[PDB]
Design a protein around this ligand. Structure first.
Ligand SMILES: CCCCCCCCCCC(=O)OC[C@H](COP(=O)(O)OC[C@H](O)COP(=O)(O)OC[C@@H](COC(=O)CC)OC(=O)CCC)OC(=O)CCCCCCCC
Ligand SMILES: CCCCCCCCCCCCCCCCCC(=O)OC[C@H](COP(=O)(O)OCCN)OC(=O)CCCCCCCCCCCCC
Ligand code: HEM
Ligand code: HEM
Ligand SMILES: COc1c(O)c(C)c(C/C=C(\C)CC/C=C(\C)CC/C=C(/C)CC/C=C(/C)CC/C=C(\C)CCC=C(C)C)c(O)c1OC
Ligand SMILES: CCCCCCCCCCCCCCC(=O)OCCCOP(=O)(O)OC[C@@H](O)COP(=O)(O)OCCCOC(C)=O
Ligand SMILES: CCCCCCCCCCCCCCC(=O)O[C@H](COC(=O)CCCCCCCCCCCC)COP(=O)(O)O
Ligand SMILES: CCCCCCCCCCCCCCCCCC(=O)O[C@H](COC(=O)CCCCCC)COP(=O)(O)OCCN
Ligand SMILES: CCCCCCCCCCCCCC(=O)O[C@H](COC(=O)CCCCCCCCCCC)COP(=O)(O)O
Lengths: 126, 62, 44, 110, 54, 110, 431, 126
């Protein structure tokens, strides 16, 4: 899959540009509301697939208090979905709470894997 | 008795080990066994596959 | 400087085996002549 | 990924089975359906007209064709069953997914 | 001697030489056995009887 | 670890064929079980190639086997191998069973 | 930084260093543990300890003199150290107590007391020092029924039947002027040492040491010393290598430096540029390893030693290590060679430029006894910088690819597989 | 299989009896010599099958020095048999060394299993 380093490179270019941000941001906001993961009580970083080594590394480096809350949001959402209901509207994730809490741990583990890999296939001068 | 004394192996050892030669004779025999069994495998497969060709009575009415 | 590696198979990994690939690209040329000789299919 | 690939194999072997069985009725869709599909292999370069005559056992869809298609049609179901066991072995490693696309190790039911 | 890195070592051409020799062996082995058999049974075959009934 | 130990399917080949621990003192009588496995492959393969030419009707049956002998290319090889292969399969099985009776392999824990 | 040799019938070598604060003077002989037989094995280890006993070290301490000695397979040493303006007293002690009079040292009381301590040393070594006794066992299976097989400390059984007559016989046959080198290191000038010697006369014995009937020969084999009560497995494995005074001497040292040494518990040792480490660390199959290239007068060894607590994955450790060796014939890169060049220079640059004059004397005397001359460190560096990838591949194709091996192990080695499954890993079968 | 308690009961009766011992002992001695387990360097108690709980118990209670020697005799015999040779006649087990070194540990473990097992199915009086 696509790297979060590449996702951030494209996104930052779109956001720094005034004309593109005024044209692509409203589309992205209503793509978020139509998806409907907040209505089950989840933040976006709960949805990222975790069966790969870069993502297993990021979850160990996470603090204990943020890790206990993530486990509860995931259990609550499974139970909400087997009953085929939604949560009460006063328990929906708000926009100001949908923060990228795990992205810095991911970008740090990715940058180290690229540095290690370049060093294992170096062309040396004389 | 000490463990640094190796026991007697003089019944089974060679002229001089001569690694140019000890490898010669073992790998000629391993090569011959692979040559004959690859030819035999190729005759077995072609015997089974040819049985699916037209029979004698079908070729007589050809 | 670093030669780009495509994950596992690097540019130095494909050049130290290219002669080997030509001899395993022969190893089935040599299996092919034993594969079908025996029902008519001639090589050229 | 390994579980998806063994499944693609089961699908191919299952189209083959059904095709061989419809030909064993030997009505009028049975004869002309086998003619259209088996004559496709006569276009392979330099080797095609040898493959059709070995598939037929002769010069057309005839008696040797119908007797060999029934014996193969009995066989392939037992090969599909052996691929179904290998399919289940690859599921036992990681288990099943779920409709949300996240981990299921926090809440499991026997 | 140095037969090693031309005969024994290079397994790429070993398996090659195993197969390449398998095809050549079959052709000459066939011709040799069919000549010995047809000569051991001389005077019984059809191609010889056919000549005697001239 | 090695791929032969990590892969789901090759791990079973390794544990049964490659790295399996065996007692140092077993003799050639312990080789009959291998042969019975080649026997079963000989019979199944030879039988499927004959079933392509066999007819089971009571008025057609004897003459189908004589047709495999005379008209089928290398059909006399398939039948005689097959017919004599069953006599060999039974002889290796009697020796396999007589061994286990001599060496007590029936006893607990087996 | 240059050594100076003269001859008078007595060879005299010297590496003067004006900026040091001590001086070492001694005599080195060209006979070691590979110059004795299975009956008198350990007679040299007992000669060292007679030199270092009390009443001889007391007599030196009253004058301000320290003593040292070392036994190896090709040579022995007997060294005296002092302050720089006390070197003539060092030579006198070395003359009186060692070369001329020794009836004082071989007395009946000093001999028994020395034998008791040496037996306790050797018994302790065989019960507690596991990495070093497995390497000694490797030498004894690789070179079995030859002189390079005998252990340097001696064996507890042969060491019990020694008497003073065995010492005196060995002295008359090997402590000879034809088999000797007089050394001097630290703050000592060559002319002063030469002048002090000719003022005396200083000769031990004449010469004609015995010639050794058998030459050293390598044999592929194994020896297993199983002990299930110990908490680890210790293993060492090698092939035949290069002797001293070979053209491939530095190329074999560079090849050992490519795979190097490892400690799992040190953080910086886990970050070395060694491709073998990408395979072991994911399941942690070992605690440490080290690659060696040992060289003698007649033969050598090239290989590695390891210790591990993961006793269920030994076969993965041996397998992955031997597959990396195969790459020296087929696919070694230029970066791996330029790394090993500069780390080999740092290695032997620290061995030959330490601050201890005792180590200098042992190195100098052993090299001059074989070559007649010492190769400087500026010359050895130029030979190392001239090695190419082609030289490595040519060396490995002759010494490593499909060649016999020697193996030794102790401890929990149930998981170490048979000889022929390890021997088969010396070629790839994918080339 | 038959219990060693029953084997010992029958044997002791035969041995205490004078007429039966003079009639059954020479047969038993030459049954031992014709078997040929001493010629491979084994005592009889090496031959007893060990895949059962009473016999696993007896082998734990065995002293360390007797247990190390048993392991060596068993390895030496496997190696002697794959070569299809016999050992040198000066390495054969002698009669005075073929002692029942493991029988007391077996009879003790058997007597305890019978006592436990009677106590689990007792008929009580009132
Ligand atoms: C139907 C065809 C099926 C094909 C295979 C059938 C094989 C079944 C034979 C029965 C059997 O498996 O046991 C045979 C047994 C010897 O087994 P062992 O391990 O104790 O001795 C290993 C040897 O010393 C070393 O033999 P080595 O490994 O050193 O050399 C190999 C030997 C080949 O022998 C074989 O193939 C064994 C079958 O080379 C030669 O013989 C050279 C002459 C050309 O011998 C005996 O104990 C008594 C044998 C007579 C009774 C046989 C009656 C059976 C009906
Ligand atoms: C429903 C099921 C019923 C089945 C009934 C089974 C009858 C089938 C007949 C099969 C015949 C095979 C007989 C041999 C049995 C195999 C096991 C065996 O006999 O052991 C081999 C034994 C080895 O010698 P050792 O005693 O020294 O032990 C090994 C060393 N540690 O050495 C021996 O014991 C001697 C080996 C010689 C074998 C040949 C004797 C028989 C010859 C004619 C048999 C004719 C059969 C057609
Ligand atoms: C005879 C044919 C087949 C049988 C008996 C079979 C059986 C099963 C069973 C019992 C499961 C358990 C979970 C579930 O039911 O979803 C499963 C899962 C699965 N099967 Fe099959 N299958 C067959 C064919 C196929 C085919 C043709 C494909 C794809 C081309 C496939 C791909 C999969 C996948 C990907 C899963 C896992 C789905 C998940 O866990 O989300 N199978 N199969
Ligand atoms: C354990 C495996 C098998 C055994 C032991 C076995 C045994 C036999 C025997 C004893 C005969 C009679 C031989 C004779 O002609 O005198 C026979 C005949 C025959 N068998 Fe099998 N069989 C086996 C498997 C199969 C299979 C799987 C097939 C079909 C796919 C098959 C097809 C036939 C046919 C067509 C005949 C007809 C007569 C002939 O061709 O000889 N057999 N079989
Ligand atoms: C002790 O250790 C051992 C061991 O010693 C041995 C010997 C074995 C080896 C094997 C056995 C003992 C027996 C196992 C054998 C089977 C399960 C046999 C399965 C048999 C078959 C015949 C499968 C055949 C399938 C086919 C598709 C072929 C049939 C027809 C064909 C190809 C015709 C169609 C062709 C065309 C062109 C249309 C072990 O596995 C083993 O591990 C325990
Ligand atoms: C290098 C030299 C090689 C030379 C020799 C050539 C021979 C090559 C072939 C070797 C033979 C193959 C190896 C043997 C093997 O893998 O299988 C035999 C072992 C028993 O099979 P198993 O995989 O344990 O059973 C298979 C099982 O482990 C798996 O169970 P599963 O089916 O997943 O459960 C589903 C059941 C659910 O129950 C139901 C159906 O309700
Ligand atoms: C469990 C059943 C036991 C019996 C299995 C018998 C199956 C045969 C497989 C043998 C494979 C040997 C490993 C190859 C290897 O190590 O490197 C091979 C060595 O072996 C060979 O060359 C092939 C020798 C014999 C031909 C193999 C087919 C035998 C006939 C098959 C008959 C049907 C059963 C490569 O040669 P090299 O190592 O010198 O480079
Ligand atoms: C079914 C009979 C009952 C007994 C069980 C049968 C077991 C015997 C199987 C014989 C060995 C088959 C060789 C498999 C080759 C290696 C497979 C592989 O590369 O795994 C996959 C790729 O496989 C595929 O895409 C489809 C394989 C279909 C094979 C159909 C024969 C490699 O992926 P990976 O590196 O993650 O290894 C798996 C780790 N569990
Ligand atoms: C699977 C069947 C194996 C049965 C073996 C029993 C012995 C009878 C052999 C009958 C074989 C029929 C073919 C023939 O006649 O060829 C004959 C050649 O003989 C051989 O090479 C023996 C073949 C057996 C060697 C082992 C092969 C390993 C199995 C391969 C599976 C991939 C004649 O064929 P031809 O047309 O002349 O080239």
């Amino acid at each position: 899959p696509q790297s979060f380093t590449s996702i951030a490179r494209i996104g930052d270019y779109i956001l720094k540009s005034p004309v593109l941000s005024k044209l692509c941001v409203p589309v992205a906001n209503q793509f978020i509301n139509l998806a409907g993961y907040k209505k089950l009580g989840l933040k976006f970083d709960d949805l990222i697939a975790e069966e790969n080594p870069i993502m297993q590394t990021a979850l160990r480096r996470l603090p204990e208090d943020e890790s206990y809350a993530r486990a509860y949001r995931i259990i609550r959402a499974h139970q909400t979905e087997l009953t085929h209901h939604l949560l009460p509207r006063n328990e929906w994730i708000k926009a100001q709470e949908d923060v990228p809490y795990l992205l810095p741990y991911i970008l740090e583990a990715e940058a180290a894997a690229k540095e290690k890999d370049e060093l294992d296939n170096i062309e040396v001068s004389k | 008795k000490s463990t640094y004394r190796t026991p007697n192996f003089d019944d089974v050892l060679k002229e001089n080990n001569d690694a140019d030669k000890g490898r010669s004779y073992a790998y000629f025999m391993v090569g011959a066994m692979g040559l004959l069994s690859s030819a035999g495998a190729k005759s077995t497969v072609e015997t089974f596959i040819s049985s699916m060709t037209a029979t004698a009575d079908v070729l007589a009415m050809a | 400087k670093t030669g780009l590696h495509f994950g596992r198979l690097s540019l130095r990994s494909l050049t130290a085996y290219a002669p080997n690939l030509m001899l395993w690209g022969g190893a089935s040329m040599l299996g092919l002549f034993v594969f079908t000789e025996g029902w008519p299919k001639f090589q050229d | 990924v390994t579980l998806w690939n063994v499944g693609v194999i089961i699908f191919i072997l299952t189209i083959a089975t059904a095709f061989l069985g419809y030909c064993c009725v030997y009505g009028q869709m049975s004869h002309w359906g086998a003619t259209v599909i088996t004559n496709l292999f006569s276009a392979i370069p330099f080797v095609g007209n040898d493959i059709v005559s070995w598939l037929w056992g002769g010069f057309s869809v005839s008696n040797p064709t119908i007797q060999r298609f029934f014996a193969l049609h009995y066989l392939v179901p037992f090969i599909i069953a052996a691929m179904v066991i290998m399919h289940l072995m690859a599921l036992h490693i990681h288990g099943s997914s779920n409709p949300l696309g996240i981990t299921g190790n926090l809440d499991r039911i026997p | 001697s140095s037969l090693y890195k031309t005969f024994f070592k290079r397994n790429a051409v070993f398996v090659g030489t195993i197969f390449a020799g398998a095809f050549v062996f079959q052709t000459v082995f066939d011709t040799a056995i069919t000549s010995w058999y047809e000569n051991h049974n001389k005077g019984k075959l059809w191609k010889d009887v056919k000549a005697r009934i001239a | 670890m090695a791929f032969r130990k990590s892969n789901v399917y090759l791990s079973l080949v390794n544990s049964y064929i490659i790295d399996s621990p065996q007692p140092s003192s077993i003799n050639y009588w312990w080789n009959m079980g291998s042969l019975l496995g080649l026997c079963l492959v000989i019979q199944i393969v030879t039988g499927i190639f004959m079933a392509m030419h066999y007819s089971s009707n009571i008025e057609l049956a004897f003459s189908s086997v004589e047709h495999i002998m005379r008209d089928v290319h290398n059909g006399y090889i398939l039948r005689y191998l097959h017919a004599n292969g069953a006599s060999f399969f039974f002889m290796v099985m009697f020796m396999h069973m007589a061994k286990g009776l001599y060496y007590g392999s029936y006893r607990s824990p087996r | 930084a240059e050594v100076t040799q003269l001859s008078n019938g007595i060879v005299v070598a010297t590496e003067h260093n004006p900026s040091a604060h001590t001086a070492s003077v001694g005599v080195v002989f060209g006979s070691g543990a590979a110059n004795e037989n299975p009956y008198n094995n350990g007679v040299s280890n007992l000669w060292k300890n007679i030199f270092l006993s009390k009443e001889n070290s007391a007599v030196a301490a009253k004058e301000g003199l320290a003593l040292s000695s070392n036994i190896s397979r090709d040579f022995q040493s007997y060294i005296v150290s002092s302050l720089p303006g006390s070197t003539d007293k060092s030579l006198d002690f070395l003359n009186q107590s060692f070369i001329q009079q020794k009836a004082n040292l071989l007395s009946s009381s000093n001999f028994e007391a020395t034998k008791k301590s040496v037996l306790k040393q050797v018994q302790d070594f065989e019960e507690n020092d596991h990495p070093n006794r497995v390497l000694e066992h490797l030498h004894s299976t690789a070179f079995q029924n030859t002189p390079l097989s005998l252990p340097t400390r001696g064996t507890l059984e042969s060491l019990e039947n020694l008497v003073v007559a065995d010492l005196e016989s060995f002295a008359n046959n090997h402590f000879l002027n034809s088999n000797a080198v007089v050394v001097g290191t630290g703050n000592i000038k060559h002319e002063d040492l030469v002048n002090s010697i000719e003022s005396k006369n200083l000769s031990l014995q004449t010469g004609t040491k015995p010639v050794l009937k058998k030459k050293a020969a390598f044999l592929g084999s194994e020896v297993r010393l199983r002990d299930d009560t110990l908490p680890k497995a210790w293993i060492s494995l090698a092939v035949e290598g290069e002797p001293v005074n070979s053209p491939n001497y530095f190329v074999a040292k560079l090849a050992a430096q490519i795979f190097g040494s490892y400690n799992a518990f040190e953080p910086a040792s886990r970050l070395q540029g060694i491709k073998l480490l990408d395979n072991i660390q994911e399941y942690q199959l070992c605690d440490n390893f080290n690659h060696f290239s040992l060289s003698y007068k007649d033969s050598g060894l090239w290989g590695f030693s390891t210790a591990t607590r993961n006793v269920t994955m030994i076969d993965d450790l041996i397998h992955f290590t031997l597959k990396q060796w195969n790459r020296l014939t087929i696919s070694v890169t230029d970066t791996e060679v330029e790394r090993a060049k500069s780390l080999l220079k740092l290695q032997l640059g620290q061995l030959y430029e330490s601050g201890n004059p005792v180590n200098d004397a042992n190195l100098l005397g052993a090299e001059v006894l074989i070559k007649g001359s010492k190769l400087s460190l500026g010359e050895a560096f130029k030979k190392i910088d001239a090695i190419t990838v082609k030289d490595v591949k040519a060396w490995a194709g002759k010494r490593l690819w499909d060649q016999d091996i020697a193996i030794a192990g102790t401890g929990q080695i149930e998981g170490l597989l048979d000889y022929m499954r390890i021997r088969s890993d010396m070629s790839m079968m994918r080339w």
